[PDB]
Structure 1
Amino acid sequence: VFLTHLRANKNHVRAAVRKLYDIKVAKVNVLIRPDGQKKAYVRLARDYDALDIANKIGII
């Protein structure tokens, strides 16, 4: 679940996750918070593992 830029596209967050983490992604579900912060649910592919990358970034 990424807090993204407010002008992010759902076609950005596809290509701004691969470019940052070497990841293929499946389906992105983007909502704006009532703080007015855009929040994006990136569901990865099957062959990747979300917990595997979460330690790799630092979301422990």
Structure 2
Amino acid sequence: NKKNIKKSVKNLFGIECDKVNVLNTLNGDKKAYVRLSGEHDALEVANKIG
């Protein structure tokens, strides 16, 4: 659920989340768009994770 993802992402990475949108795919996997806050800037954090 969205709340759990937001907490989880903050725990797992330096990310803080402005808004989290989710969708259930056909294949059985959930896809979460996590919109980053201006507290950090995504590109570096993305580069570090992959």
Q: How does the TM-score come out when normalised to structure 2?
A: 0.87
**Number of paired residues?**
50
Which runs of 5 or more structure 2 residues have no equivalent in the other structure? none
* Percent identical: 52
5+ unaligned residues in a row in structure 1: which ranges? 1-8
Aligned twin of 1:11? 3
With the length of structure 1 as denominator, give the TM-score of the two structures: 0.75
In structure 1, how many angstroms separate the alpha carbons of the residues matched to 2:2 and 2:14?
17
Displaced runs of 4 or more, over 4 A: none
- Greater relative contact order: 1 or 2 (C-alpha under 8 angstroms, separation 6 or more)? 1
Point out the structure with the larger helix share.
2
Q: CA RMSD in A?
A: 1.0
